[PDB]
Structures are given as C-alpha cells and as structure tokens.
Amino acid sequence: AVQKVVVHPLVLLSVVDHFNRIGKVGNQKRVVGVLLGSWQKKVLDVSNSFAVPFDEDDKDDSVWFLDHDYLENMYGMFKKVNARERIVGWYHTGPKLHKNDIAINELMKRYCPNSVLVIIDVKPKDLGLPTEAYISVEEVHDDGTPTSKTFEHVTSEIGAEEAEEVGVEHLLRDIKDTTVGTLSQRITNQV
C-alpha cells in the first residue's frame, strides 16, 4: 500500500519531450512509458522515466501492442549506469482513463507487484494540478454482485530536491511573482 507519491520535475519535462517528439514515427493520440523510483516507507518517490514503443486502435479495446524486449533491454542499460533506482510503474497521457488500461496493468504488474499508474495531462488546463495517481485493488463490490478489479485514487503531490530546483529557478527568472504578497497575492487566491 501507499499513502502518497512524490514526483520530481524531471519526469514532467521528459514527458513533454516525448509527446512533442512522437510525431517523428507515426500519428498517435497518446504515449506510454515506464516510471523508475524508490520506496522510503509507504511514500513513493519517482525520479526518472523512458519511452517504450506502443500502438493502439481507436475502437476495439481488445487490440493493442506493447513491447517486452525493448523494455527489458533499456532497463538493463539504465541499471548498468545506476543501481539505486528500480522499476516502479508506468505513465500514459490523454486526458481521460481508457477502458483498456487495466489490461495493460495486469501485464506489467509482473515486473513490479505494486505497479502504480500516473496520468500526466500534457496539454494545459486552468483549474489545477496536472497529474493523477491510481492503484489497482479488488473489492467486495456490494451486498452481492461479482467481484472485479478497478482503480482507486491515491493522493498526489509534486516534489523537489537540491540541484533540481536551482535549474528551475534559473529558467523561471524572467517571470516572477511576490514571495508573500501584500493584499495583491492573497486576494487573488480567493478568486
């Protein structure tokens, strides 16, 4: 079980890169990849990711094609460079959960028993946070109807670390806002 996930900026930026570049291979609505990370205690920290070739069909949810061998090879190379990260889960984009997703989950749950799914919404929206995190569990469902497998939400937050925030703060220097604000920042918040 998990009580919260902490996501670093680097993964967010790499996901934007993936979504922009994919046009080089063939038009698709969404993209998919692995998340690497680590466990402290019931809190999960994500810190890297990489692409994986994926294909889909727009109507039939019985048809799709991930790829085992690319995944295993790339994880081998990444492990040869560094050893403290391990497989933790996966991500896809697109704004709404697709029926298909559980069928993917029960695949790569084999590579990590506690596979957690993070949805990152690459194109903007005004109201709030960009990402969502979900975990898969069966249920009693009712007084009496068939048990099944679905996701439940888990609370999500965006983290930072030393020498990742410095680059961010440098990139964001041109546009800045008051640290505390004097009735010009608190009043906006209420709106």
Partner: peptide, 9 residues
C-alpha cells in the same frame, strides 16, 4: 515536414 504524417495534415 515530418516523416510520420499524412499530406492532408
């Protein structure tokens, strides 16, 4: 132009 897309794009 990208190699991955259609003319009508």
């Amino acid at each position: 132009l990208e190699d991955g897309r259609t003319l009508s794009d």
